[model samples]
Target: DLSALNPELVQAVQHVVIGPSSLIVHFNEVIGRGHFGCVYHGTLKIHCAVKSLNRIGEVSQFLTEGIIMKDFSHPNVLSLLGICSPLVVLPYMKHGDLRNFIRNETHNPTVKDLIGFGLQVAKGMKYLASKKFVHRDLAARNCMLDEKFTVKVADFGLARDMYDKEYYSVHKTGAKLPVKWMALESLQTQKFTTKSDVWSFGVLLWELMTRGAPPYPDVNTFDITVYLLQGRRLLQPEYCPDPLYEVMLKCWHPKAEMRPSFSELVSRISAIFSTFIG
Candidate 1:
């Protein structure tokens, strides 16, 4: 039996669904590190970024990422190339995370171009909304940028029934939230919807305009609830145009229904982009 010839290779395999040997990852450098995983600059024929989950419990996130990449394809959404244990390969983005890029960029995309990127992100979210997927976490730090300065939504929460009281109650046990980015209702009920995501998106726009300044820098995390519930809003970025700031204001409205859908947001920002470019 040829089993004798390949027994050694079989014994050495490390895989879930696909055989470990079937895929290859040669990580070159650590691009970024987070609680769940570390992203690395790596190779897979061409250059790629490999996000490697650090814990056994993180398998679900790896699979979730694969599913999200499978379902959505847009110019402003990150794409997948391959996956394996500790290796989530994707097309590399030299510009890295959107917040850092905006903070450090010397090439200085015009205010027009900056708003255009925001519009692009809205377009991506509009598509995801069309598919009825909620990106529970939307922030500049969750966006990736290519060399061309194109926005690719990253670090998004995939399809999860966060509204399932039991699921989220158990799931978020002992979690530290970015309270400033959270919608007021989400803080109260631990419920998230596309409209809640829109609230976070407004904060994201503020991030871009402020060049990565932390949202509500003067407000403490523990105090955010009362701060927001008091009908207070983040002050407009110094250079933010009036219309763009108005759009952001709409996103932060207290009631979910009062806020616009991502589709309408797309339309609004698209019009803003055209008006600026001309």
Candidate 2:
């Protein structure tokens, strides 16, 4: 009910509301599908991506993501263009999600391109952290690339405000989690924080280095919990630079506080990316 939503949140929804008549989504033009629902290529003023929120009882949760996105305007962060009932309008990213973009070798991404992508994601994540938001789900699959290959962090269904501590606790039921990408403490206590996001970012970086190979290639999901408990971590990909792999190790540190902030990551990754240019 709207009663559960605060006045500010209500205002956000009103700010982006669009009349249903103005939109047209081509049902056959599927963009992707996930827990919230399917996205289709659509037209809203200009061309846009349309996310459907038709799940039985997920209107509030679905709309919450749009509301949370209303305040964001960073170039590397996906923006909410408008809301028209079951549809959420967004700027279309032609290249689609990063994971599949890499896996298919559609662009034949070079190592330097991968480093630049990592830097772009770090910048977007730094902006999110600055706004005091936690993206409980941050992975290559959740990131989209524009025609220019600009990385825009997307998919916010699992994201929550840092103000509520309980928001960090993972419920055992419902949507599937990215377990292999999770931090050690997250697996142990079902808790998440910015540091845990850093841990996941490390996995994302590994994905980039490996050209989108799945993490822990030889381990099953359940056994990965024990593997992590025993101090095991993903091995460095061949030709991966020592400096970059070291950063991943820091992100997977046993102590959460020891991990770098997204801001620090931005600088660290930027430094490495610069080396390639010169």
Candidate 3:
């Protein structure tokens, strides 16, 4: 379904491929790392971030990431300019992620800013939904923000092309998960659709509203999963507005089919924004 778009459009989004000569070697310093890779703050002709896979020998993860990045192209989504062999060059997020921003704000932002950021997040997710791709890992930590504070979904390492069963199975593990934003289906069967992504998006809405408080703060991951499986929803924090809370509930519905589509989510969030401005 994602291939419904034009080939040229998809190609345009492909990160530029560079060779050894093209590699600009400057010590950008290490910013972060994980089991699979390490991210560095590197400078080429322009300031850019480089994520190098330490284990590029794993052909599956390498190919999977390439496919996911190739298909995904939107302003709110991180742009994959090109791949330089094992390295992926991305535009640097001067302001870091939403999680860091909230931590630094010291005081809560005005309702206007919260709603605006929410709208941006929805817009990003809607774009992904249209492509029929679910950002399997849509969390505050994975979202990047620019100097202007615009949201850009980053970290596509966990992103799966919905059509690929093998890729899904590999990334789909319920044990020791980021259970806070995870939907019931994802928690139970490790199954995720675009709708499930919307459920996670709702949890993201809560995080933005509360200025980065972890979801289900009172309960541990085990209790949260148990509650979710029994049709109980994450209790909305005190700061979450009634309208947004309603949206979250609709998204976190127990039955996947009962959940609103991203199209519906965009409309609802747009309506909320209009209400705030009007």
Candidate 4:
């Protein structure tokens, strides 16, 4: 993701900086739980999360993350405060992650809230796209919601130039499948790029509309690869509006190049948002 670098990336890399003592403003509460890692909740002058990985070797996952963090700043991309070894220090989010937030939300969100949320995420990805970075693993769970309900993208602690939630879905083999979010190319060639990320973002839009329902109903882990490869796509959520769903379809184009760039996505979604308001 280091299409470019800044002081923040350098500062992040210079520090292997893990604090041995838990007493001094470190987290202990498990706010988030998943196969990859668990986010620990803590407070100093401001709330913070200590995102720790289950695998020791996974610390290298964030090497690119440190490099990439320096390039962009926007409302939706999560701000990296600093790092503490395997624990990536992040500004604590009141609502831990997007899926959880959507699932547990007592009341349905307004049209403004739903579309505005997608616009924020698209804006964040647009910044990344401008810098020649692809999120590769974009999904609803990859985005974090702050107190103000703004979605900030975080958790680049995967094997990709990097890489959530309640109502946990279990794979038959106990492995997680992002098939519904994955483009046909990724399912076949095992390649990823900005185009693939755009496909995933389309899935995120679906999740936003459906409030975190798992995509591609009746498709199982084993068949997902073949399913998407055959050009099957997700159905629009029941409540999804026509225009936004049209945008999602464009993102799901079978050919990667046909998928809209994140920049276009930002513009298109913003237009949708304006119309929603009007």
Candidate 5:
């Protein structure tokens, strides 16, 4: 009996190990690449988005993404179907990212249309926050919009768990940075929490309102970095509504602690929508 217990202990010790056999299907086309690996537009026979890691160190990144997908289930979030070593399959977004949609639209969207998009984004962020996940890179490029314009937050490459140890904590300022959407704290400390995500949310709202214009069109990344360091935000476009403007301002507040939580933001946006479209 004692000898039999040895095998059980070994199994328990090795239980955390995930293997390549877990992959349900092989990937086909090379869709895109980022810091970690190349993303393939492949099917799991069930129509899932397959992303495979190229670099060896990216295995941990893949596992982090897998953990996030496995733990969170929301309509606004891209669902992770399953994970194999070096490969992770997620729900396929046919319409692609919001950047493409903005580029394709011949005309600028009305306030109603912008609000609708913002609502979808808020719904997704709210769900993530409720589950204690922070989408550090919340932007038009990262948000996938379906044909119906239902938005799903995609690309968990830079996402971080609220409970995880802070690994990347130093902020580096530069030109050509994603400075337009970054909150002051994130700009200064490179710390991303739920509040930092809200800051990005404010910028996403701006992008929806502006039909995907890059954040701070007039200023370069270096200038924007300087501005952020001096405690300033990218100026909101003139056409943005007062309520929306106020919400965006609240989001970009220099003090991360002063920013609204996801629930608060959802309520604010909900109230604005109800008043506008009722």
Candidate 6:
């Protein structure tokens, strides 16, 4: 019953792994938590983020996350340092995730900075989509900011690699979902594709323009099904530029086939960002 793991996973379970002697994690100081586990502030020679699993039962998913992240090397996507068995080491993002920065930062970001952040996130997701990986969860909360405020997309717990297939279907997996950020097709069929992720990215940009306010604040998760089924969508943020809001509207197209891909979004967002400079 326990011998069905992958060879690639078995190898990673032993190699490039770390121990407590080289890692100093503050157990009480959790920086963040997600489906897999809690992230702690830690150091291994240099400071880093330590993501530890909730229990031994989740080791499979935990290791799977490492295997998936190991192949990624884009500047905007989070890179894996090494495995600490039940824990994964990542770059210590000083400003934390984008959502926190927008909500808690003492100083507000300029319009140019907001556009830059959106572009960086699109670049990261574009890279992932190119590698045939579906993030499934793309939001401001999953995007981290380095010391220089560069956006680095993180958290791959819900991510799936479509080695030969174009989409991954969820089969009553009972996985927790960010319902408000999900696309209509995803909510209807439990299928996840790159285009489904595009819908989530649209909501993430909405979060950015609104300075991290929770999406659909007045609606309940149970109501999202009908609310979206009726063709209602998020309204433009008060101070958001008309063009930028227009881009987000395109992302929410009723048909996933009509939604823009991450690569297309990169160009679109970059074009909008360029206008802010000169």
Those runs of model 4 whose alpha carbons end farther than 4 Å from true positions after fitting are 1-28, 54-67, 157-177, 229-231
Clashes of each: 0, 0, 4, 3, 1, 0
Report RMSD (Å) for each prediction in the order shown.
7.4, 4.8, 6.0, 5.1, 6.4, 5.5
Model 1, residue 199: C-alpha shift (Å)? 0.4
lDDT of 1 by residue, 50-157 (tens): 666653235544454455465567888876665664566677888887877788857686778778779888988888888787787788777888877789887653
Per-candidate TM-scores read: 0.82, 0.88, 0.80, 0.80, 0.76, 0.85
lDDT of each: 0.72, 0.79, 0.68, 0.71, 0.66, 0.79
Q: Mind giving the per-residue lDDT tens digits that candidate 6 earns over 154-191?
A: 86742222211112223357655667779988887878
How do the residues 132-218 of candidate 2 rate in per-residue lDDT, one tens digit apiece? 888887888888898888998887632221211211323455434567778878776777798999999999999999988878767
Candidate 1 lDDT score at position 88: 65
Write model 4 residue lDDT over 45-105, tens digit each, in one string.
6677766666443334456555456445778888766555355666788876687678885
Q: Give residue 114's error in model 3 in angstroms.
A: 1.4
For residues 83-156, what per-residue lDDT tens digits would candidate 3 score against the true structure? 66377767778877676677575646676677677778788888877877777777766787887777887766
- Give me the overall lDDT of model 6: 0.79
lDDT of 1 at 270: 79
